[PDB]
Each structure stands twice: as C-alpha cells, then as structure tokens.
C-alpha cells in the first residue's frame, strides 16, 4: 500500500543484515561470557 513520498521517488531503505533480536543475542552472549568467565 501507500508508504511515503521518499519511497516513491527512488529513495529506498535497506534493512540491516543483523536484526535487533540477534544483536540483542550477541549482547546477551557477551554478558553471559563476562559473568561466567570474566576477561578470560
């Protein structure tokens, strides 16, 4: 359906390769590694 005026003049927006639900999983993995191991 209708989106915007920028989208209709050749100006498109590409989605990021990493979604937020996986950036958050990377962050959670970093936090868990810090808690369980430390700097090791």
């Amino acid at each position: 359906d209708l989106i915007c005026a920028q989208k209709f003049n050749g100006l498109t927006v590409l989605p990021p390769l990493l979604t937020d639900e996986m950036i958050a999983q990377y962050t959670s993995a970093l936090l868990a590694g810090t808690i369980c191991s430390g700097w090791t």
Partner: protein, 49 residues
C-alpha cells in the same frame, strides 16, 4: 486527467477538495490526488510498485 499525464494506481480518497481545487500536490510537487473531470470524485494517485 485533464492534460495532467502520469502513471499509477487510482484508488478512492477520503480527501475533501474545496470547489475551486482540482488537483493536490505533496512536498515533491507530484500530484497525489486528482478530481475526475466528469463524476467529480477525488482519486488518490500512487505510482506502481
């Protein structure tokens, strides 16, 4: 439409044109809506995907 040429999908609008207004424009000066010269209904123009 009345000499105004273009390409797109003519849906039906909820726009309320005043009697002296025939076509409408957006910030890019592209006609976003036109008034049918005969049935006098407001059609929403959106270029094809």
């Amino acid at each position: 439409f009345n000499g105004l040429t273009g390409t797109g999908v003519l849906t039906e609008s909820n726009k309320k044109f005043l009697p002296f207004q025939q076509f409408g424009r957006d910030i890019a000066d592209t006609t976003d809506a036109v008034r049918d010269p005969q049935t006098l209904e407001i059609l929403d123009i959106t270029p094809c995907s």
